[PDB]
Structures are given as structure tokens and as C-alpha cells.
């Protein structure tokens with residue numbers, strides 16, 4: 156079949172944003188495609204991470220990946236750093252990418268605020284993501300909207316290398332969902348829901364408890380009209396909450412706009428909290444099962460084994476094309 | 484004993500400049516220290532290289548490394564790309580280095596002329612060189628003068644990581660020779676002798692033949708005084724040629740200034756050509772022996788094996804300190 160690749164950084168617990176925009180579709184896709192799902196830890200470190208917490212977020216993400224229904228026998232789930240080829244590839248691509256191309260990446264100008272001194276791994280994030288993808292001769296990359304641009308740079312780098320050193324890489328394509336590709340922060344509806352938001356009220360994580368979900372939802376930035384209708388420019392808050400409600404419940408923005416008429420925010424929120432609560436209930440229960448057993452580690456071992464064979468073969472080929480090392 | 488590390492890029496055939504400033508001292512040091520000598524191929528690719536030529540320069544450098552007297556049983560000689568840990572380390576260090584620190588590297592502002600678009604591997608060269616070094620718990624780095632700054636950045640990165648994530652790395656020290664640390668181009672005595680000089684007349688390679696050496700020496704940029712005396716600012720050409728003559732022959736600048744009095748350039752050069760010719764004669768003969776046998780490959784296999792055990796153990800430790808992957 157066709158091959159898909161997608162990664163999720165172990166920089167916090169994944170949010171209902173990471174779930175709706177990417178992970179949720181992983182559970183279906185793993186049956187239609189040859190899928191590689193990665194815990195991108197080498198990306199996580201482009202920005203400070205407490206060591207103990209990175210270790211634990213890596214193992215939690217793995218458990219959630221499984222908990223939401225990824226089948227270790229249908230998809231290969233693995234940790235990037237456990238596969239050296241990602242760093243080997245990343246360096247070879249860093250050599251054909253242009254500083255100007257890196258400097259212009261949106262995620263880099265954003266993440267690099269006027270902030271005094273930035274780590275180069277923030278500039279060089281993109282070639283590593285290109286490796287992640289190109290290593291597996293990837294066809295489709297199922298990601299939320301924010302990663303689109305990085306994927307285009309991935310494509311340019313594949314084509315650059317192919318015409319510079321001969322056909323080797325497959326030219327991947329992004330696959331952003333038509334709905335819920337950019338879930339916004341509950342605290343500022345102009346910013347995306349980001350799991351590394353300094354303000355925990357910005358996101359709801361897949362591991363948040365009922366009480367906590369009820370508060371973040373309650374606290375969510377709405378407006379004054381007490382009118383439950385969809386408007387992205389007028390009521391960016393209420394719009395966002397509508398989507399989450401839609402995508403998560405099954406109902407359209409309309410059947411929800413209807414259901415909440417002469418009805419106000421207070422109730423609309425307490426219901427959204429229960430929708431999100433119920434959605435995460437089965438997930439969280441399976442999550443606990445995976446966290447208390449050595450089974451998760453076995454999964455990951457076999458996942459790296461499999462990624463190592465495919466990717467290490469691609470590095471050999473790339474080396475052969477560029478003339479690195481010796482004839483093997 | 485103490486550990487030394489030094490690398491030589493496979494970007495051309497090494498010059499009498501690379502020989503006088505670094506390689507020559509390798510032959511003695513390998514007995515006093517625990518030495519790792521590397522064919523830095525991943526560095527070579529920060530700038531375009533024809534694949535076939537890179538492959539062949541990698542194997543030639545290996546042969547010269549041996550030919551000049553490096554003893555595979557006293558020093559570990561190996562190819563960087565054959566050891567994944569160099570790229571793994573390089574990425575972890577790219578994450579603690581600062582763009583501003585890279586941007587200010589001398590070799591990067593030079594190599595990055597006003598040139599329209601530069602490859603990021605030219606900005607990121609330094610973290611890879613830091614890995615090369617730090618991976619082996621390196622004490623001394625025997626290099627020519629130009630690499631000094633890169634070594635200081637290496638030191639800052641070691642100290643940065645040690646205080647950020649705990650003591651792990653040894654703080655290396657440079658070891659530049661007092662004599663012949665900056666052999667200059669035969670064609671422009673303001674520029675260093677660089678083996679990737681577009682103008683072949685700029686350098687004499689360890690593989691140049693008698694005829695060729697005789698021309699490059701003859702062509703060498705002198706002056707008008709026809710006076711064989713040492714002056715770095717006045718006669719930068721003649722000064723340089725004096726050094727090469729000194730360091731290579733054994734005689735001081737003085738015994739040479741003396742020997743050439745009422746004597747002119749024409750003869751002083753034809754003699755220098757024979758000094759350089761005779762110096763390279765044994766080297767070149769041993770070089771041919773190493774190029775026509777599978778013995779060179781065995782050397783390199785055992786060299787990578789040995790580098791892989793030491794470096795892979797260091798990556799494990801660095802990962803453990805930063806919290807990457809899982810507990811191993």
C-alpha cells in the first residue's frame with residue numbers, strides 16, 4: 156500500500172488539539188496505509204525540557220498512541236532517537252537546505268520571538284523533520300495545518316537531492332483534515348492550541364480529569380452576546396468551542412447552533428465539558444493499562460527494530476549517492 | 484594516557500600545509516597519547532563535492548594517514564560517517580549552541596562570502612566538530628591555527644552541557660604547533676594554504692609529482708628585492724617559502740637566510756622544490772602500497788569498530804543526561 160509517516164513531539168501531554176487534528180485519524184489510516192508513527196524526542200529538545208519530564212512524556216505519548224487504538228501489528232510506533240538514521244539523514248539534508256530557507260520558516264520566526272539568543276536546533280528543526288519523512292519513502296503525511304509549510308520544505312529538499320544526486324526519495328504530500336486542523340487555545344482564540352503553552356488553561360490534555368476539564372471549559376474565552384452561533388472573526392472563542400463540540404460529538408455546527416437557542420453559554424459549556432470528558436474516558440482507562448506494564452516497552456523495541464531496517468537502508472543509499480564513506 | 488582527537492576533511496588531497504600544521508605531528512603523538520584520527524567526510528559535504536571524487540579522496544586520505552606513518556595498532560584511524568554517534572551528538576549539541584555563536588564563526592563568514600544562498604551545514608559545521616571531539620573524552624586537539632576558534636566553541640559547549648545536564652564531558656584544549664601553524668598559499672601570501680583552493684597553484688599536495696612541485700614553487704609569488712631574507716609584512720611570499728624550507732629541511736630561518744646571500748630566487752626555489760620533492764618521496768611510495776591492497780579497508784573497519792564502542796557509549800550517556808529515549 157502507500158506509506159504514511161507522522162510524528163508527535165514529547166514536549167508535554169498531547170491536547171484535544173493534537174487529537175482532533177492528527178492522532179484521531181491515525182486510528183483509521185493504520186488500516187488503509189503502511190504507517191510509521193513516531194515519538195519525535197530529538198525535536199522536543201530544540202527547546203528546553205526537564206530531563207525527567209521528557210523521559211516521562213515520551214513514555215506517556217507512547218501509551219496514548221496505543222490507548223487511542225494504534226495497533227502495534229498494523230502500524231510501526233517508535234522513538235526517533237532510538238533510530239540513528241534520523242540524525243544521519245538530518246545532517247545530509249542540512250547540507251542541501253539553505254539558511255535562507257530555514258530563516259523563513261513560520262514556526263521558526265514565531266518560536267524565535269525577539270528572544271535574546273536562540274538554539275540552532277530551532278533553525279534546523281526542518282531538515283530533521285524532512286529526514287523523518289523521507290527515510291521511509293513516505294507518500295502521505297497526515298498532520299494538522301501548522302506543519303504544512305515544513306512539509307513543503309520537505310518536498311523541495313527531496314527534489315533538490317533527487318536532481319543533485321539521482322532519484323532516491325519519494326515526494327511526499329501533506330494530508331490535513333478539512334475539519335479541526337487548527338483547534339485554538341481556550342484562552343486566546345487567535346493562537347493555536349499548543350501543548351507547550353505556558354498557560355495550562357490554553358489547552359485540555361488527553362489526561363486532564365473531569366474537574367479540570369470543567370474549569371478550562373468554563374474559563375474559556377467567549378464573548379458578550381450570550382449567542383451560541385458560529386463566526387470566526389466575530390466570536391472566535393465560541394466558534395472554536397463549537398468545532399470541538401461538533402467534531403467530538405458528531406453533530407454539525409448547525410444542529411448545535413440550533414440545540415442552543417434561547418440557551419446560554421453556562422449550559423453550553425457544562426455540556427461541552429461532558430462531551431470532552433466522555434470522549435477521553437475510554438482513552439484514559441486504556442492509557443492506565445499501558446503505563447503499568449512492560450508491554451509498552453516491547454512494542455517500542457519492535458517498532459525501533461523495524462524503523463532501523465528501513466531507515467538504515469535509506470541512509471546507505473543516500474551516502475552512496477553523495478559519496479560518503481565507502482562502498483557497502 | 485591522555486586522549487587526543489583530530490580530523491582531516493576529505494575535500495581534496497592534503498597539502499604540505501595540512502602536513503606541516505597537523506598530520507606531521509600525528510606520527511609522534513600517537514606514541515605519547517591515546518589518539519583518534521578521523522577522515523571527516525560529513526564535514527566535507529557542507530560544501531559541494533562530486534560523489535565519485537569524495538569517495539576517492541576519502542580512500543586517499545586514509546592511505547596518506549597510514550603512508551606518513553600512523554600505526555593502526557597505536558592510533559585509531561576511521562571515517563566519521565561510519566560512526567553514527569557523531570551525527571547523534573552533533574544534533575544534541577546543535578540544541579545547546581546559539582545561532583549567534585555559529586553566525587560569528589570566522590570560517591563561516593569567510594566560507595560564506597556574499598554568496599547568494601549558503602547551505603546550513605556551513606553554519607552548523609561547529610557542533611559536528613564539537614561532537615567529533617567531545618565523544619572521545621578528548622584532552623588535546625592537535626590542529627593548525629585556523630581551527631582554534633572552533634575549538635573554543637567546542638569548550639563552551641562542553642561547559643554549557645555539563646552545567647545544564649551534569650558533568651559528562653572533558654574540556655578539551657587546542658594544541659597548535661609554534662611553527663608552521665599557518666602555511667600560506669603559494670599564489671597569495673595573505674590567504675592560508677587551503678586544499679580546496681580553486682587555484683591548484685595555491686598549494687602543493689602530498690601527491691604532486693616532481694615536475695608539478697617544480698612549477699608551483701617556481702610560480703610562487705615572491706617580490707623584487709631578489710633578497711632571501713625573512714619579513715612577514717614586507718616579503719610575505721619569501722617569508723612563507725622560508726618556513727616551508729626551514730620546517731621541512733631542519734635548518735633555521737637564519738641558516739637559510741645565510742646560505743642564500745648574493746644568491747637569488749631562481750636557485751632558492753629550485754632547491755626548495757627538491758626539499759619538498761624528497762620529503763614526499765617515501766610518503767608517496769608507501770601511499771601506493773596502501774592503495775593497491777585490501778589492507779587499508781581492514782584498518783578502517785577496525786578503526787570504526789573501536790570508535791563506535793567509545794562514542795556510542797557517550798551518546799547513551801548524553802541521552803540519559805538530556806532525558807532522550809528510554810532507560811538503557
Ligand SMILES: Nc1ncnc2c1ncn2[C@@H]1O[C@H](COP(=O)(O)OP(=O)(O)OP(=O)(O)OP(=O)(O)O)[C@@H](O)[C@H]1O
Pocket residue numbers: 161162163164166167170172173174175176177178297298299300301302335336337338339347348349350351352
Ligand atoms: N491546535 C492544533 N489543532 C489541530 N492539530 C494540531 C494542533 N497543534 C498541533 N497539531 C497537530 O498535531 C501533531 C502533533 O504536533 P507536534 O508534533 O506536537 O508539533 P506541534 O509543535 O505543531 O505541537 P504542539 O504545538 O501541540 O506542541 P508543542 O510544539 O508546543 O510542543 C501534528 O501533526 C500537528 O500539526
Ligand SMILES: Nc1ncnc2c1ncn2[C@@H]1O[C@H](COP(=O)(O)OP(=O)(O)OP(=O)(O)OP(=O)(O)O)[C@@H](O)[C@H]1O
Pocket residue numbers: 489490491492494495498500501502503504505506625626627628629630663664665666667675676677678679680
Ligand atoms: N595552511 C595550513 N597550514 C598549517 N596547517 C593547516 C593549514 N590548513 C589546514 N591546516 C590544519 O590541517 C588540518 C586539516 O584541516 P581540514 O580538516 O582540511 O580543514 P581545513 O578547512 O582547515 O583544511 P583545508 O583548508 O586544507 O581544506 P578545505 O577546507 O579547503 O577543504 C587541521 O588540523 C588544520 O588546522
Ligand SMILES: [Cs+]
Pocket residue numbers: 185186187188189190229230
Ligand atoms: Cs496496514
Ligand SMILES: [Cs+]
Pocket residue numbers: 513514515516517518557558
Ligand atoms: Cs598509544
